[PDB]
Design a protein around this ligand. Structure first.
Ligand SMILES: C=CC1=C(C)/C(=C/c2[nH]c(/C=C3N=C(/C=C4\NC(=O)C(C)=C4C=C)C(C)=C\3CCC(=O)O)c(CCC(=O)O)c2C)NC1=O
Length: 213
């Protein structure tokens, strides 16, 4: 009935697939290396750059404005901070940009440029996924990666302008459900959420091959 309910129900299978991807399965059980973690952070930076650029283009359109929460959710700055730590001061020149990263980025710019009504599917997937699992993954990461005590490297995993992830997720759902769209568009939003999960699955499959070939 509600768009948030329909999204959750329709992507339950691809979401399990994403969790079952070998790279994530290993991450979840504390088997993650510095080389692997670095690759995922670089991935998220490219992804969020593109997403946030497209949110900014579309923030005033009726098809996104109601789910526009810049202060609460923006992740580009946090990833800039972490990548300076993980790759050093010239991080922006040396971070990798792989085919599977580019495929995600390319879709995000297509959506933002020609089908901005679908941007909510991508925002939902990324922001709510990352908000929800960040506390759990952070702990796993700090145990597995044995950071120096230098106060940096994992800013991505804290959304400082959200005091309660639960309360924020309720508001965000409420705002999603207030978006107005034709039936054809609503179908395409749901499909786009599935596409977002598939773009993540393909990313994880690539990172595993790069790490183990
Ligand atoms: C990457 C690691 C990752 C972990 C461990 C994670 C866990 C996680 N995701 C959740 C919600 C969510 N998680 C996602 C997304 C994902 N969930 C995924 O495991 C993956 C790979 C995606 C997307 C690529 C979304 C879209 C929601 C909101 C579901 C909703 O309430 O509608 C919740 C809230 C409770 C639940 O629904 O089970 C947890 C604990 N999310 C993550 O993103």
């Amino acid at each position: 009935q509600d768009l948030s309910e329909a999204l959750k129900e329709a992507t339950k299978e691809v979401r399990t697939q994403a969790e079952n991807a070998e790279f994530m399965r290993n991450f979840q059980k504390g088997q993650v290396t510095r080389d692997g973690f670095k690759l995922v952070m670089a991935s998220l930076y490219h992804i969020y750059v593109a997403l946030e650029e497209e949110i900014e283009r579309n923030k005033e359109s009726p098809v996104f404005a109601p789910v526009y929460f810049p202060e609460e959710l923006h992740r580009k700055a946090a990833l800039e901070q972490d990548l300076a730590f993980w790759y050093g001061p010239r991080w922006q020149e040396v971070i990798p940009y792989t085919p599977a990263m580019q495929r995600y980025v390319k879709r995000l710019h297509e959506v933002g440029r020609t089908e901005p009504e679908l941007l909510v599917a991508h925002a939902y997937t990324r922001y709510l996924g990352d908000l929800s699992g960040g506390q759990v993954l952070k702990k796993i990461a700090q145990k597995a990666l044995d950071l120096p005590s230098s106060g940096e490297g994992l800013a991505f995993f804290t959304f400082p302008n959200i005091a309660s992830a639960t309360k924020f997720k309720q508001l965000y759902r409420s705002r999603m459900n207030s978006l107005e769209m034709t039936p054809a568009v609503r179908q395409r939003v749901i499909e786009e959420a599935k596409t977002a999960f598939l773009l993540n699955i393909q990313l994880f499959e690539e990172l595993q091959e790069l790490l183990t070939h």
